[PDB]
Amino acid sequence: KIAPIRNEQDKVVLFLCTFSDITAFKQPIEDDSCKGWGKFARLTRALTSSRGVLQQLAPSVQKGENVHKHSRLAEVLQLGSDILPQYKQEAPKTPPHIILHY
Amino acid sequence: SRGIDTEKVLQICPKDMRADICVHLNRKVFKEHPAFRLASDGCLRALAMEF
Amino acid sequence: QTVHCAPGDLIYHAGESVDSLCFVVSGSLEVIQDDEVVAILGKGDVFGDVF
Amino acid sequence: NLRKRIVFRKISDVKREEEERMKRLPPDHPVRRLFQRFRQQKE
Amino acid sequence: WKEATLAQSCANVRALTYCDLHVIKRDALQKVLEFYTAFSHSFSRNLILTY
Amino acid sequence: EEQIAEFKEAFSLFDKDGDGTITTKELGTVMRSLGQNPTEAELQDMINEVDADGNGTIDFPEFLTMMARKMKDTDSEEEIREAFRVFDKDGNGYISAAELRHVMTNLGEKLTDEEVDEMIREADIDGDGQVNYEEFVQMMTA
């Protein structure tokens, strides 16, 4: 997923590309391995981030692929919040309903 | 920094105390960076004195 | 130069460069080599290297 | 003399070595090379 | 320890957040490294610069 | 040999059954979650082949053998690992003067105590009486 970030001077300076692994939840493809199940285990061992609490309810349910993609993309779509500074000297804005004592 | 001078505080103490204080002050780099994981006591102290 | 060393303080850590003859005039010190006692120094003894 | 250091063995170490010897290579090419290099250095 | 010569900086470095730096001069590092040859033989192999 | 220790977490995550081995219910749950619907007989023969016992229980060595076969580590890394394993009688990954004397005597290339000490200090980098993996590979590289 790619989401460029603008700048305070109304320009685009920095790109941002995020990454995610869906190896254990897609069509299995192998090139050269000792065994098919061994290759499957190797592929599954790399998806710990997906298998964690992000989609930990997948084994307890069925046909969860219709929501796994949405769950994975929900975290990535939040990057607009961090894009607000836009690579600029942003002041430490106070939280709402709080008046600075100086 | 308040009213304290780090150089004066370092100079007041003797040599071994100076070396150990400097090693502690640079522990953040020393323990973390992999290039320093093979360092002996003498070289570690001689580097912590100059950092 | 006169140096007062309190008990427990190290003088020459292993691997440090030695560059100073030092004469013991009071008390007593010991040398530790590989976590063992190999010699004991008393009054009127000097340890270092023949510079 | 600080520059000079003495060599010695420990009683516990020699006892353990004797005990291990009481309970007592064709593909050992890296260590064969190590031994050859050590012999060359000592020569 | 490899270049053994000074060079002009080819880019500016600017702070962004409140940072802490641990700088070491070239002369002291070279002296310590040349004193500890065994340490240098691994320091050169293990230290890789980011930029 | 110490890199395989990290597979315990992956094995625990995969084995949601919690009975010490992969259960048929757990396998069904994971295949349903992944979405693919292969043959039950196909999965039965696959698990029978994977498991050494073949009694429907997947053990740690069953995955360990496949992982070791598929690792395909470097030849130099394998050789130095074998050298460390044969040099360390206790198998703790540490090399001592007693171990060095033992292997030298066993191989028959006995050396003097001073020579053994010099060989130890040649590889020793921190000067306290230990021989490390990095120290030995640095010695061997030259």
Which residue type is seen at A54?
L
To 5 degrees, how large is the angle CA B44–CA B50–CA C3? Answer: 80
Q: How far apart are CA D2 and CA C47, in angstroms?
A: 7
How many C-beta atoms surround the C-beta of residue A20 within 10 A?
14
- What are the Cα distances from residue F79, in Å, to A98, B13, D30, D33? 66, 51, 7, 13
How many C-beta atoms surround the C-beta of residue A70 within 10 A?
9
Q: What is the residue range of F50's domain?
A: 4-71
To 5 degrees, how large is the angle CA A29–CA A30–CA A36? Answer: 105
In 3D, which of A81, A82, A87, A77 has the Cα closest to residue A2? A77
Q: Tokens standing for E12?
A: 């500016």
In 3D, which of F22, F59, F12 has the Cα closest to residue A52? F12
Q: List chain F residues with CB under 8 Å of C12.
A: none
Q: Which chains touch C (3 or more CB pairs under 8 A)?
A: B, D, F
Do the Cβ atoms of F51 and F60 come closer than 8 Å?
no
Would you call A28 helix, strand, or coil by DSSP? coil
Do the Cβ atoms of A48 and F13 come closer than 8 Å?
yes
How many C-beta atoms surround the C-beta of residue A37 within 10 A?
16
The answer for F61, left when phi > 0, alpha when psi is -120 to 50, beta otherwise, is alpha
How many C-beta atoms surround the C-beta of residue F123 within 10 A?
19
The answer for A26, left when phi > 0, alpha when psi is -120 to 50, beta otherwise, is beta
Tell me, what DSSP letter sits at residue B4?
-
- What are the Cα distances from residue A40, in Å, to F62, F67, F92, F99? 14, 11, 32, 42
Do the Cβ atoms of A68 and F43 come closer than 8 Å?
no
Strands A5-6 and C29-32: unpaired
Sequence-distant (6+) residues with CB within 8 A of F26 are A59, F15, F16, F17
Unique residue bearing structure tokens 């040398």: C31
Q: Tokens standing for B40?
A: 């002996």
**Residues of A at the F interface (Cβ-Cβ below 8 Å)?**
24-25, 33-35, 37-39, 41-42, 44-45, 48, 51, 58-65
Sequence-distant (6+) residues with CB within 8 A of B41 are C13, C14, C15, C16, F126, F127, F128
Would you call F65 helix, strand, or coil by DSSP? helix
Which residue type is seen at F12?
S
Would you call A12 helix, strand, or coil by DSSP? strand
Q: How far apart are CA F102 and CA F132, in angstroms?
A: 18
Q: List chain F residues with CB under 8 Å of A34.
A: 66, 69-70
Q: What is the CATH number of the domain that holds F27?
A: 1.10.238.10
**Which backbone phi and psi does D36 adopt, to 5 degrees?**
-65, -45
| Contact call for B43 and E29, based on CB within 8 A | no
Unique residue bearing structure tokens 């071994």: B16
Do the Cβ atoms of F133 and F93 come closer than 8 Å?
yes
Q: List chain C residues with CB under 8 Å of D1.
A: 47-50
Q: How far apart are CA E40 and CA F38, in angstroms?
A: 58
The answer for C18, left when phi > 0, alpha when psi is -120 to 50, beta otherwise, is beta
CA distance E48 to chain B (A): 9
Do the Cβ atoms of F58 and F51 come closer than 8 Å?
yes
**CB hemisphere CA count around B13 (13 angstroms):** 13
Q: Does F138 touch chain E (CB under 8 A)?
A: yes
Q: Tokens standing for F137?
A: 């590979």
Q: How far apart are CA F4 and CA F60, in angstroms?
A: 11
Q: How far apart are CA A86 and CA A11, in angstroms?
A: 9
Q: How was this structure determined?
A: cryo-EM
Q: List chain E residues with CB under 8 Å of B29.
A: 22
Q: Which of C9, C11, C15 sits opposite B40 (nearest CB)?
A: C15
Do the Cβ atoms of A72 and A54 come closer than 8 Å?
yes
Q: How far apart are CA A53 and CA A82, in angstroms?
A: 23
Would you call A51 helix, strand, or coil by DSSP? helix
Q: Does E30 touch chain B (CB under 8 A)?
A: no
